[PDB]
Amino acid sequence: RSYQFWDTQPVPKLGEVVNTHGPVEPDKDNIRQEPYTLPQGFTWDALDLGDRGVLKELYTLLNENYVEDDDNMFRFDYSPEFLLWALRPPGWLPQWHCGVRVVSSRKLVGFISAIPANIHIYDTEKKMVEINFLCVHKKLRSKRVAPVLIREITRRVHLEGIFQAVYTAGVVLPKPVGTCRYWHRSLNPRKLIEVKFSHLSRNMTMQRTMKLYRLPETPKTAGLRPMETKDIPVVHQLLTRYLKQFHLTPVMSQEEVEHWFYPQENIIDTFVVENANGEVTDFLSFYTLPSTIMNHPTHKSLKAAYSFYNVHTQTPLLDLMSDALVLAKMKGFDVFNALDLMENKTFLEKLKFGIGDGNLQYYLYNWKCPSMGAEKVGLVLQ
Numbered sequence: 001r002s003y004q005f006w007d008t009q010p011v012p013k014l015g016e017v018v019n020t021h022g023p024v025e026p027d028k029d030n031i032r033q034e035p036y037t038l039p040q041g042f043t044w045d046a047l048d049l050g051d052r053g054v055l056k057e058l059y060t061l062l063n064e065n066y067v068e069d070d071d072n073m074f075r076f077d078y079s080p081e082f083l084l085w086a087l088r089p090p091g092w093l094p095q096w097h098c099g100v101r102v103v104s105s106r107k108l109v110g111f112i113s114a115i116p117a118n119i120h121i122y123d124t125e126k127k128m129v130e131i132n133f134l135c136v137h138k139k140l141r142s143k144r145v146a147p148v149l150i151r152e153i154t155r156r157v158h159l160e161g162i163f164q165a166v167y168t169a170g171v172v173l174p175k176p177v178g179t180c181r182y183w184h185r186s187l188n189p190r191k192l193i194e195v196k197f198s199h200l201s202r203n204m205t206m207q208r209t210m211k212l213y214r215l216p217e218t219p220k221t222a223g224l225r226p227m228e229t230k231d232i233p234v235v236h237q238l239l240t241r242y243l244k245q246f247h248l249t250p251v252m253s254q255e256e257v258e259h260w261f262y263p264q265e266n267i268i269d270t271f272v273v274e275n276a277n278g279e280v281t282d283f284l285s286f287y288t289l290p291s292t293i294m295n296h297p298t299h300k301s302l303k304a305a306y307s308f309y310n311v312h313t314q315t316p317l318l319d320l321m322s323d324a325l326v327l328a329k330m331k332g333f334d335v336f337n338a339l340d341l342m343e344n345k346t347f348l349e350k351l352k353f354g355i356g357d358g359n360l361q362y363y364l365y366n367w368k369c370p371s372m373g374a375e376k377v378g379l380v381l382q
């Protein structure tokens, strides 16, 4: 369109209207046994994240070289313990933690990952992988290293008999199946304005701004409490039933639900509504992901909470999310982030979220299907 790399790949063209559902190419019956060639002086290395030293190397690569905002002011700061959560879910494979190192110094300069996931896309369930944490060191940018990382992880996934993948990106590539928008809810507006994440309205004083965003000290929903081990099955049951209404969703086992939702401090929070009868009827969840405030003398970090999966059957969704905001404020978050997917548009403007810059595009690899509105997207990635 022209895309030197993406034009060679089994994905639909940008601008082509798709009215069919299925693979772009058939499953491969023989697969390349040898890794793709990297530029000279660089080598492949599978990263054992159970090793404290290797995990920290990955932490640093991403801390210094991962996604920045459009103004080049903030960079994601995934913690080592978060990366362990995100990258070793049930069924994780060691070959799918794909690093690139400088041969001489051993410096980690590139990475890409796959984790397994069963994905429901319209009327089909497929075993896929989710691709995440594609990163190339700043000093290595614009040298066509990304295509080698993408082809190499493809080869490694192919060896395991898997021929479809799902991924998101803030850039337009062939061809989005869904387009989402970022929204932000101020919790600590004074800090957000000071570090220039947000700006003071010409029509509002700082005093008025703090008043606008002020929240109750405690949640209002009767019987809200953190998720416990006994809650794992009912949380699985609630999520599975809730997700049916959307066109792009994960299909989680009970073991997967335990991994993704069981609370871990500073990583993942899940709160359930246990009613007057002792029945769990609702749950909210958010993950923890701080950002580095680049080159700032006094404020070094911003603590952000990210809306994950929120299931309602008896409690209004609006009330659930109001309580999520209160809980995040209690836990010291500066901002609460959510996408416009699932039923989120029903609460975003009401709870004083504001729209952010940029788009999050959702993609499938080797699967043609019609595109969908954000409201039909029911998949949230890390």
Ligand SMILES: CCCCCCCCCCCCCC(=O)SCCNC(=O)CCNC(=O)[C@@H](O)C(C)(C)COP(=O)(O)OP(=O)(O)OC[C@H]1O[C@@H](n2cnc3c(N)ncnc32)[C@H](O)[C@@H]1OP(=O)(O)O
Pocket (backbone or CB within 6 Å): 002, 003, 004, 005, 006, 007, 065, 066, 067, 068, 129, 131, 132, 133, 134, 135, 136, 137, 140, 141, 142, 143, 144, 145, 146, 147, 150, 153, 154, 157, 158, 162, 163, 164, 165, 167, 168, 169, 170, 171, 173, 365
């Ligand atoms: C069956 C199994 C299938 C498994 C595979 C499924 C596919 C997985 C796909 C990956 C899902 C990743 C999900 C996430 O992790 S999204 C997060 C991506 N990470 C970042 O944005 C971190 C900071 N940025 C970087 O590290 C970048 O500069 C990267 C590494 C992204 C590009 O490095 P560099 O800037 O040095 O560029 P290049 O000269 O090497 O190569 C340029 C080519 O790369 C295409 N490009 C640029 N950005 C992306 C992007 N985010 N997804 C896919 N492709 C991208 C670009 O259009 C061009 O192709 P084309 O325009 O010529 O055609």
Ligand SMILES: COc1cc([C@H]2SCC(=O)N2c2cccnc2)c(CCCN2CCN(C)CC2)cc1O
Pocket (backbone or CB within 6 Å): 067, 068, 069, 070, 074, 075, 076, 170, 171, 182, 197, 291, 292, 302, 304, 335, 337, 356, 357, 358, 359
């Ligand atoms: C500044 O506001 C935004 C910040 C971010 C992200 S990017 C790194 C970061 O730390 N972010 C952050 C900071 C503080 C709180 N939550 C998030 C985003 C996400 C957009 C992702 N894109 C858009 C497209 N491409 C390629 C650049 C990054 C949106 C914001 O409107």
